[PDB]
Design a protein around this ligand. Structure first.
Ligand SMILES: Nc1ncnc2c1ncn2[C@@H]1O[C@H](COP(=O)(O)OP(=O)(O)OP(=O)(O)O)[C@@H](O)[C@H]1O
Ligand SMILES: Nc1ncnc2c1ncn2[C@@H]1O[C@H](COP(=O)(O)OP(=O)(O)OP(=O)(O)O)[C@@H](O)[C@H]1O
Ligand SMILES: [Mg+2]
Ligand SMILES: [Mg+2]
Lengths: 7, 518, 523
C-alpha cells in the first residue's frame, strides 16, 4: 500500500 | 487483453497507434493500481467513440418531402433547405455537415423539426441542451490527470449514438452564460468552424476528432448570439403562425398526436373547428402552439376522466360552447379617439399591438413620459415632437404649445418594458391629434421611424407586426415605403384582409390616419 | 533496450544526463511497481519529444508567392512577411522564427492563412485552439507526482508532429480566460518570449526545451490582449475587404470551390459579376467573405435541386435580375447620397468594423428658449463634439450672418436618424458645425458633399482615423466631393485609384474652408 497525490 | 476490441473498432492511424501505445503501456504496469485505472478508463472511452460507423442516408426527395410534410405543417424554408441538402447529397459521396440556426418565437416548431430532419435524412438523433452551459468543460472536458475527467458532452453523445453522421440539435444557443467566469460560446467556435472540424482535439481525448461529418442544427429565440458564432451558422428565420395555420396544425397534427397519447380510440372524442378557434382566440394570444397542445391535452384527459366517471355516455362532443364545461372561464379577449394611436410592436416573443395615448393639458411646457419606456423611445418622442414643432403653422397648431401646453405620453403597457424606434411615427400622429382635436381613426395601425425632416425610415420584423395586426381587428396598416419589398413574404390572407399603405413621410400618415383633413 | 533508444534519439547534454540518470534510477526497481511506471512514463515522454529533427524550409520565392496566391487573394502584408522570412531563411541556416499576431474582423481568412503559410514554407502545421481555455496546465502540464500526469498540450503537439520546426496557429488568443482562477495568457508569456524560448521549462518534463525556431502565428479579433502579450507579438492588421476584392475572391476562390463541393459541371451553372456584386451590395453587409460564400453556396444548392426536380432545363444562368428568384428579398441597403440641397442636414462619414457607411446628420432650429436636445443614441464624446461645434458657431456668429442671441431665442435639436444604432466619436464634429450653420441661416448644405474631421474651439480641423472605408462609403454612396482633414493627406497614399479618380477630395485646415466648400451660398 502506497499513497499517491492526485490533482 | 484488449487489442481484440481495438482491431475490432477499426480506428484511424493516430487513434489506433495512441490507444495501442496506451494498452502496451498498461501491460508493463502492475494491476490494482490508480494509474492503471486511469489508462483502463481512457481505453474504455476510446473503444466506444465512433470512428468508422456511418448511417446510410436517404437519396429520395419525394419520400423525404412526404416525411417532413407528414410530421410538420408549412415550415417551407427549412423543408426547402433539407431538400437542397438531399439534392446535393445524391451527386457526391460526402459533404461537410450543414450548420444551421433556427431562429423564431417559442412554440414555432424548432425541436420536433430536428426530429423530422433526423428521421427524414436517414441520420440518427441526439440533442444537447445549451441552456445552462456555463463553462468550456462541458464541451472540451478535462485532462485525465484530474479525478472526475470525462470527454466533454459532445463526445459523450457521439458515443451515446455510435455513428459518425448524427444530427446534433444544439438547442437554445442564446441561453448560454458566456461571461468571464466561463465562456463556452468561444469553445463552440472550434465545433462550428469548417476550417477545424476535421481536428476537434478534446481535452480528455487528445486525439484529433472529425466533426465535419456531423449535421449541426441549432435553435434560438433571438439573434442575440455572439458575432463569431453568427458567421459560422446559417440563420433561418421562422415566423409566427396565423389563425388558419394554427387551425391546420391543430386539426392535422396536434389532435392525432394527443389522441394516441392519452389512448383515445376512434369514436370517443370529437372536437370541431370552432372549439379550436375559440381556444386560439379566447385562451391563447401567443405566436406558437405550446398553449394549443396544453389546452387540447386538458380536453383529452378531461374527456378520458369523464368517460371513466360516467359510463352512461360513450362519446364526448366539444363545439365551442361547452368549453366552459371543460376549461371554465376564458383568459384573454371602436370609436375614433383623440390623441390615441395603435402602433405595432415586435418583441422576441413575437408581434403585439401597442396602444399609445397622449394628453396635452394647459400647463407650462413640461414633457412627461410614462409606461416603462426605453431611452430610444423617449428620444423618438422628442424627435416626433420636434417634427410637430417644425410644421406647426402648416398643421394648425398655435405655436406657443411648447410653453403653454404640457404633454403626457403614456403607453398603457404598464409594467412591460418597451424599446425601439419603430413606434415613432405613431407618436407624432398622437402628437398631432391631441394638439388639434382631430381624432385618430381607430381601425388604423402604423409603424415607422421618425426623421426630423419628416421622413419614414424602414423597420424590422414586419411579418410579425402584420400578424399581430391581423388578430387585433385592424383593417388599415401604415407601412414605411422601403418595407414594401417585404410584402411578398407575407401570407396571402393577411395581405387580403389588411389594407396596407406604404408611406414616405408624415403628410401621408396624417392624410390617411386622421379623421378630418389637416 | 531503452539506452539504445536514448542514444538513438540523440539529445542535448542536460536531457541526456537527466534521461540516463533516470534509467540508471530505473535499473534498481521492480518492473511492476508504481515508481517504475512513473519513471518509465518520464522516459518514453522524453523519447517521444523531438530534440534535433527539423524540416527543409523552402527557398524559391516565386513558387512561394505562387502558393500564397493559389490559396488566398489580397493580403499583401502577410505575404510580404512570409516571403521576407523565406529570404532571410534562404541566407541563414537557422533564425529565431517569427511571432505573429493576425488581428482583424471575422471571415477575413486568418485561420486558413496559417495552413497556407505552412504549405508555402515547407514547415509542418500544428493547430491549437485557445478559445475559452482556462486551465494553465494545457501549456505546462503537471508534475509527475500526479496520477495520469503528462506534459502540456504544446509539448504533446511537438511530440506528435515529430519536428522542432512547426507552425503553431494560436486560435483565439484574445478569447482566453484571465481571472484569479485561471490565467493561461500569462503562461504563454514564457513561450512567446522572443529571448527565453531557448529554455522553456514546463512542469512534467522539467528539462529546458528549445522553442526558438517554432513559428508562432496567433489569430485574434481585437486588441483585447494583455499588454505583455501584445508586446511579444508582431501585430498585422487585416482590414475588411472592399467591393472589388470581394468580387475577386468570389470569382477566383469562392465560386470554384463551391462548384467543387456541389458536383456542378462546367456547363450547368454560370454566375456573372452582376449577381456577385448584387450579393455584395444587397445581402451580405460584412467585413469577411463567409456570408458571401453562404449566399453563393445557397445559389449552388438551389441550382442543384432545380436541375434535379425539373430535368428538362439543363443550364441555369444566374445574373443581376433573378437573384430574388433564388435568394429572395434584399436583406440590407447601403446608404446613398441625397438629391436636393437641404437646410440643416449634412452627411458625415461613419466607420464601424463591418465597414464604412454614410452618416446623415440633421438639425432643426425652432424658435424657443435655448433648449439643446441631442438624440440618436449618441455617445459622450459625440455630444461633447456637438457642444464644441456649437461653441465654434456661437463664437463666430457675427461673421456668419447669424443673430448672436440664438442661444436664448432658438431651440436646437441635432439628430442622427439611425436611432437604434449607437454612435460615438469626434469624427462627425466638423459635420455637426456645418449643419448648425445651415440650420441657423437657411443656407442649404449641398448634397453631393460629405465630410469628416474633428473640431476645436479655435476653429481648426484635427485628424481622424480610418479614411479608406469612409471614402469607399462616399464612393459607394454617390458622393462626388469629400472633405478630409489636412494631416490625413498621407492616408491618401493608400487609397485605390478609381476612388481617387472619382472623388474630388479637398483637405481642409479650418472651419471656414468647410463652410466655403460645403454650403451652396457664400457665408
Ligand atoms: N408547423 C408545425 N406543424 C406541426 N406541429 C407543430 C408546428 N409547429 C409547432 N408544432 C408543435 O408544437 C410543439 C412544441 O413546439 P417546439 O417544442 O418545437 O417549440 P420550440 O420552437 O422548440 O420552442 P422554443 O423555441 O421555446 O424551444 C411540438 O410538439 C410540435 O409538434
Ligand atoms: N483573401 C481570401 N481569399 C480566399 N479566401 C478567403 C480570403 N479571405 C477569407 N477567405 C475565406 O474565408 C473563410 C474564413 O476564413 P478563416 O476561417 O480562415 O479566418 P476567420 O474566419 O477570419 O477566423 P475567425 O473565425 O477566427 O475570425 C475561409 O474559408 C477562407 O477560405
Ligand atoms: Mg425547444
Ligand atoms: Mg478563425
Amino acid at each position: 500500500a502506497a499513497a499517491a497525490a492526485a490533482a | 487483453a484488449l487489442k481484440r476490441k481495438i482491431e475490432a473498432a477499426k480506428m484511424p492511424k493516430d487513434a489506433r497507434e495512441k490507444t495501442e501505445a496506451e494498452l502496451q503501456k498498461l501491460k508493463m504496469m502492475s494491476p490494482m493500481s490508480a494509474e492503471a485505472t486511469v489508462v483502463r478508463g481512457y481505453i474504455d472511452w476510446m473503444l466506444q467513440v465512433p470512428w468508422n460507423s456511418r448511417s446510410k442516408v436517404k437519396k429520395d426527395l419525394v419520400k423525404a418531402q412526404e416525411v417532413l410534410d407528414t410530421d410538420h405543417y408549412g415550415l417551407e424554408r427549412v423543408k426547402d433547405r433539407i431538400l437542397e441538402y438531399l439534392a446535393v447529397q445524391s451527386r457526391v459521396s460526402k459533404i461537410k455537415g450543414p450548420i444551421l440556426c433556427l431562429v423564431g418565437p417559442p412554440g414555432v416548431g424548432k425541436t420536433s423539426l430536428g426530429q423530422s430532419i433526423a428521421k427524414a435524412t436517414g441520420r440518427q438523433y441526439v440533442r444537447m441542451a445549451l441552456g445552462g452551459v456555463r463553462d468550456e468543460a462541458e464541451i472540451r472536458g478535462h485532462r485525465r490527470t484530474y479525478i472526475g475527467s470525462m470527454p466533454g458532452k459532445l463526445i459523450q453523445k457521439m458515443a451515446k449514438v455510435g455513428v459518425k453522421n448524427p444530427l446534433f440539435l444544439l438547442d437554445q444557443i442564446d441561453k448560454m452564460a458566456s461571461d468571464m467566469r466561463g465562456d463556452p460560446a468561444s469553445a463552440l467556435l472550434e465545433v462550428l468552424d469548417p476550417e477545424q472540424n476535421v481536428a476537434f482535439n478534446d481535452h480528455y481525448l487528445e486525439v484529433d476528432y472529425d466533426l465535419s461529418d456531423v449535421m449541426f442544427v441549432a435553435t434560438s429565440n433571438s439573434m442575440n448570439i455572439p458575432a463569431p458564432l453568427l458567421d459560422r451558422m446559417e440563420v433561418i428565420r421562422l415566423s409566427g403562425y396565423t389563425e388558419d395555420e394554427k387551425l391546420n396544425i391543430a386539426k392535422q397534427h396536434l389532435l392525432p398526436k394527443q389522441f394516441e397519447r392519452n389512448a383515445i380510440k376512434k369514436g370517443e372524442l370529437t372536437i370541431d373547428d370552432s372549439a379550436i378557434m375559440s381556444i386560439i382566440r379566447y385562451y391563447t394570444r401567443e405566436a406558437g402552439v405550446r398553449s394549443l397542445e396544453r389546452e387540447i391535452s386538458k380536453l383529452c384527459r378531461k374527456a378520458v376522466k369523464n368517460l371513466l366517471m360516467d359510463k352512461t355516455v360513450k362519446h364526448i362532443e366539444i363545439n365551442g360552447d361547452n368549453l366552459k364545461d371543460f376549461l371554465g372561464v376564458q383568459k384573454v379577449d371602436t370609436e375614433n379617439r383623440v390623441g390615441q394611436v395603435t402602433g405595432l410592436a415586435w418583441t422576441e416573443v413575437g408581434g403585439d399591438l401597442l396602444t399609445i395615448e397622449t394628453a396635452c393639458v394647459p400647463g407650462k411646457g413640461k414633457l412627461t413620459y410614462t409606461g416603462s419606456l426605453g431611452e430610444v423611445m423617449q428620444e423618438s418622442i422628442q424627435a416626433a415632437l420636434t417634427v410637430v414643432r417644425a410644421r406647426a403653422d402648416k398643421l394648425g397648431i398655435n405655436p406657443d404649445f411648447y410653453e403653454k401646453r404640457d404633454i403626457h405620453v403614456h403607453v398603457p403597457e404598464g409594467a412591460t418594458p418597451k424599446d425601439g424606434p419603430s413606434a415613432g411615427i405613431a407618436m407624432c400622429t398622437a402628437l398631432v391629434s391631441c394638439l388639434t382635436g382631430n381624432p385618430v381613426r381607430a381601425d388604423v395601425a402604423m409603424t415607422g421611424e421618425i426623421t426630423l425632416r419628416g421622413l419614414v425610415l424602414p423597420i424590422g420584423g414586419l411579418k410579425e407586426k402584420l400578424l399581430a395586426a391581423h388578430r387585433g381587428g385592424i383593417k388599415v396598416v401604415l407601412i414605411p415605403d422601403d418595407n414594401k419589398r417585404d410584402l411578398e413574404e407575407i401570407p396571402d390572407n393577411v395581405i387580403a384582409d389588411l389594407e396596407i399603405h406604404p408611406v414616405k413621410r408624415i403628410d401621408d400618415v396624417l392624410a390617411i390616419a386622421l379623421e378630418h383633413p389637416a
